[PDB]
Amino acid sequence: MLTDIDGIRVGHATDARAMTGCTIAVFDEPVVPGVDVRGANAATIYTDLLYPDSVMPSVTGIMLTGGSAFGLEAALGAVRYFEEQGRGYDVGVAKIPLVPAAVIYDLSVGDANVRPDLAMGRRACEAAKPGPFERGRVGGGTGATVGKLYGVRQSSPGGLGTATVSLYGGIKVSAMIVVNSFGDLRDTAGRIVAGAKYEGGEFADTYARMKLGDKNQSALARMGTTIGIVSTNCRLTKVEASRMATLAHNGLARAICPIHTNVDGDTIFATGLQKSDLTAPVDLLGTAAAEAAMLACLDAVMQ
């Protein structure tokens, strides 16, 4: 539950008919951001300010949205909304909010002509609230699918998941993940819980089929995705935030196979608190972020 971290509110905007939507995490307390874009087919916005060699931005919120490249328009809708509310970096003649975002491809399910736009991004902001939020095929995970080796027709449903890992001294590391992965989802044992299926419904084991010569038949296979946020209540520097985001990808490799493929835009945002008394080594937080991300992946398909 990402809202376990102080100052975080989560809001969904869902279109059940078109099978698309977006999800925003709003930070009522200033955060220290980081990012790691590992997929070879990612579409993001505002990520340059999330790197250690960039200045400290004023991140108002982070959004996970559907609609492929078109869906980033919902991020601008969040920016417009937050400026109206008086949030963002005070430049004197205006306030400049910042809403980094990453997308998943969900156009092959439902209505391909409906994507999150300025209005839908605003609706998610209006709905952002503390406490527990809904999981599953909601918000950014509404049109998510898992295991597309044989196309979306033989895939399993994806979704949005979340999980919290507790450490000592009140330290917490939480994750919220939208699973739209090309590969299969496995548990800690190794059994397939979601992925590419044969015509009758049995799981085909994507990786085993590719080793035998089965070719990628997904919509984006001609040119040559799992996105999420990991948050902790510890104080972090910019380097530590980006290192946390990098180590969190190890959790995706735990549950998803194959991962980081040429059709995946896998991206992990990471946040710490600017003002906080809790501190911990970055390798423990990064390992805890990997577990939280792995647990949130399974939560996305069991909810």
> Angle at CA 47, nearest 5°, toward 104 and 185?
35
Please provide the size of the chain in residues.
303
The item of a second copy, Na ion, none sharing an interface with residue 143, based on CB under 5 to 8 Å by kind, is Na ion
State in angstroms the smallest separation of the CB of 275 from a second copy: 17
Phi, psi of 72 (to 5 degrees): -60, -15
Please, how many CA atoms are within 13 Å of residue 288, restricted to the half-sphere of its CB?
20
State in angstroms the smallest separation of the CB of 14 from a second copy: 20
Q: Which is nearer to Na ion, 27 or 182 (CB)?
A: 182
State in angstroms the smallest separation of the CB of 183 from a second copy: 17
Is residue 193 within 8 A of residue 185, CB to CB? The reply is yes
The item of Na ion, a second copy, none sharing an interface with residue 279, based on CB under 5 to 8 Å by kind, is none
Which element (helix H / strand E) includes 77?
helix 73-84
Is 227 a binding residue for Na ion by CB under 5 A? The answer is: no
State in angstroms the smallest separation of the CB of 142 from a second copy: 17
Please state, in angstroms and rounded to a whole number, the distance separating the CA atoms of residues 51 and 41. Answer: 19
Is residue 71 within 8 A of residue 303, CB to CB? The reply is no
Is 20 a binding residue for Na ion by CB under 5 A? The answer is: yes
**At which residue do the structure tokens 């990997």 appear?**
290
Q: Which is nearer to a second copy, 217 or 276 (CB)?
A: 217
Q: Which stretch binds Na ion (CB under 5 A): 29-37, 52-60, 104-112, 278-286?
A: 104-112
Please state, in angstroms and rounded to a whole number, the distance separating the CA atoms of residues 278 and 8. Answer: 17
**At which residue do the structure tokens 């939208």 appear?**
178
Q: Which stretch binds Na ion (CB under 5 A): 5-13, 77-85, 175-183, 252-260?
A: 175-183
State in angstroms the smallest separation of the CB of 165 from Na ion: 26
Please state, in angstroms and rounded to a whole number, the distance separating the CA atoms of residues 12 and 122. Answer: 10
Helices (H) and strands (E) in the chain, counts: 5, 17
Site for Na ion in 127-146 (CB under 5 A): 143
Is 225 a binding residue for Na ion by CB under 5 A? The answer is: yes
Preceding amide of 258 cis, omega within 30: yes
Q: Total residues at the site for Na ion (CB under 5 A)?
A: 10
Is residue 43 within 8 A of residue 37, CB to CB? The reply is no
List residues near a second copy by CB under 8 A: 37, 40-49, 53-58, 68-70, 72-73, 76, 79-80, 83, 89, 91-94, 96-98, 105, 107-108, 112-113, 118, 219-220, 222-224, 262, 265
State in angstroms the smallest separation of the CB of 6 from a second copy: 23
State in angstroms the smallest separation of the CB of 204 from a second copy: 22
**Residues within the interface to Na ion (CB under 5 A):** 19-20, 104-106, 109-110, 143, 180, 225
